[PDB]
């Protein structure tokens, strides 16, 4: 065989909100038991050591080890565009293998969010769909949630971001509720966090017309 390494960025939910600790993950996989166990190096624009913790080794049937090193990262540093490199070296490989990842390049444009009610043609069913259009943002990392009154809602789906003709991204969020629940004036809320929003968060809400 021949081990291979994958670098994984943090988590948009974990880099945008004030509750999660973001991190970069160097996954060395297909490590054979002959000449096992690896050494990482970790560079930040060509930098250094530090807070680089390697998580517990985990065995796979595949007659092999999978081992993961994790570099915790500040929110500011990741959103600035600092480039993180993990270089893996192992006696089972001819030369060390290096991987570098960063935030997606490009000027951040901000999302415009529009709440679309249900269609008058679909208002004849028992469950109807509230649409939230989130368009014109860059990069594609965003997070979208529905909330009514105060409770987060529970039966909604969000599309992947698809590259608009402009170079910005858009997506849709659909929340299906009961027509009775909609029509009673219940106020639902599409709420988004993204890099280019003021406070990294906006919320726009939608209720039935008069």
Ligand X SMILES: *[C@@H]1O[C@H](CO[C@@H]2O[C@@H](C)[C@@H](O)[C@@H](O)[C@@H]2O)[C@@H](O[C@@H]2O[C@H](CO)[C@@H](O[C@@H]3O[C@H](CO[C@H]4O[C@H](CO)[C@@H](O)[C@H](O)[C@@H]4O[C@@H]4O[C@H](CO)[C@@H](O)[C@H](O)[C@H]4NC(C)=O)[C@@H](O)[C@H](O[C@H]4O[C@H](CO)[C@@H](O)[C@H](O)[C@@H]4O[C@@H]4O[C@H](CO)[C@@H](O)[C@H](O)[C@H]4NC(C)=O)[C@@H]3O)[C@H](O)[C@H]2NC(C)=O)[C@H](O)[C@H]1NC(C)=O
Residues that bind a copy of itself (CB under 8 A): 112, 114-119, 121-122, 125, 129, 131, 133, 135, 155, 157-160, 162-165, 170-172, 174, 176, 204
To a copy of itself, the closest distance from the beta carbon of 152 in angstroms equals 16
Q: Which does 62 bind (CB under 5 to 8 A by kind): ligand X, a copy of itself, none?
A: ligand X
* Shortest CB 70 distance to ligand X, Å: 8
The closest residue (CB) to ligand X is: 62
Q: Where does 95-149 have alpha helices with state H? A: none
Contact present, 23 and 73 (Cβ < 8 Å): yes
The C-alpha atoms of residue 92 and residue 36 are separated, in whole angstroms, by 8
Nearer to ligand X, 25 or 129 (CB): 25
Bridge partners (DSSP) of residue 7 are 26
Q: Which does 131 bind (CB under 5 to 8 A by kind): ligand X, a copy of itself, none?
A: a copy of itself
Q: Which of 37, 26, 11 is nearest to 99 (CA)?
A: 26
Residues 3, 29 contacting (CB under 8 angstroms)? yes
């Amino acid at each position: 065989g021949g081990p291979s390494v994958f670098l994984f960025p943090p988590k948009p939910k974990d880099t945008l909100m004030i509750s999660r600790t973001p991190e970069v993950t160097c996954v060395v996989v297909d490590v054979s038991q002959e000449d096992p166990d690896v050494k990482f190096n970790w560079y930040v624009n060509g930098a250094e050591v530090h807070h680089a913790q390697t998580k517990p080794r985990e065995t796979q049937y595949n007659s092999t080890y999978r081992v993961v090193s994790v570099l915790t990262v500040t929110h500011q540093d990741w959103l600035n565009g600092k480039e993180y490199t993990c270089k893996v070296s192992n006696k089972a490989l001819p030369a060390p293998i290096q991987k570098t990842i960063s935030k997606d390049k490009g000027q951040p444009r901000e999302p415009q969010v529009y709440t679309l009610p249900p269609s008058r043609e679909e208002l004849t069913k028992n469950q109807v769909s509230l649409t939230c259009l989130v368009k014109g943002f860059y990069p594609s990392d965003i997070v979208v949630e529905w909330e009514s009154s105060g409770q987060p809602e529970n039966t909604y789906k969000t599309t992947p971001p698809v590259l608009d003709s402009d170079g910005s991204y858009f997506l849709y969020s659909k929340l299906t509720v009961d027509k009775s629940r909609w029509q009673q004036g219940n106020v639902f809320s599409c709420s988004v966090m993204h890099e280019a929003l003021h406070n990294h968060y906006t919320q726009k809400s939608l209720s039935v017309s008069p």
